[PDB]
Amino acid sequence: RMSMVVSGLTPEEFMLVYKFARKHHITLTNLITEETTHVVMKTDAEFVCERTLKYFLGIAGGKWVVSYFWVTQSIKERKMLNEHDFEVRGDVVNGRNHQGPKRARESQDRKIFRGLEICCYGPFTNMPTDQLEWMVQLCGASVVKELSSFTLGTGVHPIVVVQPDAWTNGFHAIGQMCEAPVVTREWVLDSVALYQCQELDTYLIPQIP
């Protein structure tokens, strides 16, 4: 069972992946889903990539996140090489060797956002709300559509995530309508990339009294 998406590839490079996929009989799609087993990132020679939605969702699903060099080197050697040898080591934002992709694959029985309830509040850009909500679900969070539906239950802890630069403002007034902590979206992305629930401290959005 295999199914791939690609990220950061040129059309010419995609075309080689398809040929590769076809020789080895691997399903290749445009969109990542629960069915997806492999995420092929464009990388440099040290297996460092850029952060894309597929990158985040590949890690969140505990999928294989491997260098495009996996494909090209396999083509040259005329056999399917070990995913383990081409796994992404890190990314250009959070560190060239954080090993987020390996950690997540091995850590699906102890998810970083387990026991949290998360609301993706207000506008977001370059990333639809439903994909952000989906990301944190894969990482174990409960999704809340509206601030007033946060569980008052000690069973789950609530967190509000917002992207301030999408606003035009009101995101300093969320703390007047509930007591849940308000952090930027970068808290999620960094948490997912590192596959480590980050301290809120550096991500907190100060609220108006």
Partner: peptide
């Protein structure tokens, strides 16, 4: 029809 102009999240 597949996407190519994926957005890259570089803090900012």
């Amino acid at each position: 029809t597949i996407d190519f102009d994926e957005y890259r999240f570089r803090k900012t």
